[PDB]
Symmetry: D2
Subunit: 266 residues, 4 copies
């Protein structure tokens, strides 16, 4: 037979790889990723926390932005993740090597990260990345504290079994701001009904819609800024049209029901 196909690279839109300067979200919280991939730096008194890292090739850019914020590589103490796909956990292994930071994640995210996103429930081996290990396993509702800032995990399975929202409270213009970093609620091209690899997918999504609606949140952020109507490119107006947690979940549930209609009706 004809030769087997060549391996396929994980190519993404240029805006996902467009570097940007740090954009201040709150007094201690900064977007340091790219224009279209969120990576949040929280600077505490006893080191910095990174939430998500973006694509594999973004490790150097993250370290450069950390430098501009006054954070040396060894000052990064903790990495948290929304979910362990290649476009959000991509550079985690290299970040651990170059910073010594620990990774805290739930068990589902830990096992997916440790196999580099391979054998994905829905993508197979289509999107892999260098594997990394979690140094601390997190339970639902558990609180991780760095330098006086408490980060609370809220499991919201669906997009991945391990999908998690993280919440914390910063300050902004003299007042506290409850920040919620919620994972994706989409099911892009997923088989929703009767999926042998995820039998309770529909029940998990539906509960996760409700979990997101209930998060303590004055300011919602998402791994893809477009999903919560952020525009990182417009500077200090980046959050002008940012969605509430209610609007984010409702839009997600409406799309999910219609995606379920396209499937169930056939």
């Amino acid at each position: 037979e004809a030769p087997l196909p060549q391996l396929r690279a994980y190519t993404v839109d240029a805006s996902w790889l467009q570097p940007m300067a740090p954009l201040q979200v709150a007094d201690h919280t900064w977007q340091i990723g790219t224009e279209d991939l969120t990576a949040l730096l929280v600077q505490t008194a006893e080191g910095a926390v990174l939430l998500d890292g973006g694509m594999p090739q973004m490790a150097g850019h993250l370290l450069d932005n950390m430098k501009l914020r006054g954070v040396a590589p060894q000052d990064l103490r903790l990495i948290l993740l929304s979910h362990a796909h290649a476009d959000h956990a991509g550079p985690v292994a290299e970040l651990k090597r170059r910073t010594g930071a620990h990774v805290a994640a739930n068990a589902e995210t830990a096992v997916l990260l440790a196999r580099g996103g391979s054998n994905d429930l829905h993508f197979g081996d289509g999107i892999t990345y260098p594997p990394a290990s979690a140094d601390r396993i997190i339970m639902d509702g558990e609180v991780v504290t760095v330098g006086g800032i408490a980060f609370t995990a809220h499991f919201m399975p669906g997009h991945t079994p391990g999908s998690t929202a993280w919440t914390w409270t910063d300050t902004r213009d003299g007042k506290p701001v409850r920040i919620a970093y919620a994972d994706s609620l989409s099911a892009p091209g997923y088989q929703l009904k009767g999926n042998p690899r995820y039998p309770r997918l529909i029940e998990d999504y539906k509960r996760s819609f409700a979990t997101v609606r209930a998060l303590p949140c004055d300011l919602l952020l998402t791994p893809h800024p477009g999903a919560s109507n952020w525009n990182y490119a417009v500077g200090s107006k980046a959050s002008a049209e940012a969605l509430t947690c209610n609007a984010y979940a409702d839009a997600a549930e409406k799309k999910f029901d219609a995606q379920l209609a396209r499937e169930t009706a056939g």
Copy 2:
């Protein structure tokens, strides 16, 4: 200016050209592609696979196994020359689809568990789905399946974990000593004063001697061209495949010339 896109590990088309099983000995078959070796050894208590080639080769391997009368669940063991993507590529998928166990030395195990990432020389350029080794083996250790004994010979250099495997089969009932020896190339490697591999030169030099000392009637290699095999024709037509001495001699001559150019 956006960051660079990721690049896929692309190979010569003949590396990906399927072939029907080619008989090497009474129970030993090449079942990979024209230019990547994957050896199937059929025993009384199931099959052994030595290397799998590229990651996209899993289905092809299983199809050739079926043509040989080996159901997926009959694959009992996977052995490896070294844990690079073009030889260990489909190991994770093969484990999931067969239940086979992997046996490898510690160095190969850690690189396989990394999916080839953070390679001493390639960094993250040549990666593949990670897999775990179920049995760690030591230099000279014997693994027996169905009364066929496979002996490991460590030959570090191309990777720290590079291994040769030897076993005895028959050709029409007469015993034949088969040696499956890893690569001895250092493609683009910094040889002298490499911070990530300080004793590289010493290891290659010991490994040339290890290969020459292997018990061997027939030598095969992960890239058939490295031992003058032509998988396009029958195995008896490959009489003039290289001996262990000639294979190591050729590799040592290239290594010495590369070292000289680097020192100059």
Copy 3:
């Protein structure tokens, strides 16, 4: 000052270590563990499945009983677990080395098994065993099939975050029998309320009681046979007074409620 304490072994009641010959539970299902620890062998024409293995020192006994049942080590295909504590997953690492089995378990069980039971949420490092890796991660309700017998996973977290019940249909004198191997519902010495290492423990147990009551079950077995009133020592009469899923869950929940009340007000 005084020397540090010596390490302490995990010692158990003698009956947990008392070998027994294989006891037929259904036409293809055998108890092959000890008098007071369940280890179920399910034999198909395409190989065997082992559900649990007991304590670490039981490996050789299990292999001896497999040989009496005509299962060569290479024909044990799969190991399933109720939960990853030393008295149920004890010999898994050794069994994997000595057989052709792979382990299928959920992510929580996978991460605890790979720690050898160390850093347990409730037990610390007091009850440990040789680490093993799960080869296949399974999801709630996922079906694993060996030789025509389908095994369905039902997550029932609480005793451990990864606690799982497994169900399958066998036959018993001419008629189908729905077997349920339900995990422990005990909370021995656990802090139930406001546990920073398991914040949703009470909610998980409460849901797990209902999960067990709903399992497809004509014949219940448990990792500790006493918990479902089996008496393996008497042979053919071992099942004569076995509990239903309802009675098992009701008994566990009555004890859980009294423990939580004790924790609420002494």
Copy 4:
């Protein structure tokens, strides 16, 4: 039959569990373990390095001694190991959880550490401990640097496949001192000849005696202080009779040869 045996804990000589206050070895190097188990703390301006940790139950003691040395848990950057048996790597998993330190080890030590010392080539499952992962895999001769102090690895397989000596240069009285922390060369109850799990054991031990003799060394230390004739209980006189690398390897090789002779006979 009669019941199966109970599990048996790895109990040790109580002197191995006897806490001691930190003993200064050189200007930046301190013994912080117990009277009969070495655990070396190297303090730098960029954090600290721990070489070995002793038994599993020593984690709290190590951290208390670190605090006496001014090293907070988050100040520990790196853990190095001689070998991954329970009485030297015992508390590594707990130390990683409580400090955030990385582990650097060769591939053999990394795989043994990751299975908690289980399935040991010689001891089976008798000496298990909580497993840990290595965060950096190192090669023979590789240099790891923390705060300007360079640590070089020298593989000396035999006692375990992954057995490693670590060398670094410190100062004492304004002069360099080349410190060598060499692993065990013992073979306690080992089948030396024709061992199916370690076929080249004798060749590896013989090469490792030579490797130890060749180490750069003004001051030798060992995981068991008695093996290099240290006495940690006498403070400033602790090293007064410490062996050279030559003497240590010669004594170990003489013992090894007599052991091999009795086995062959």
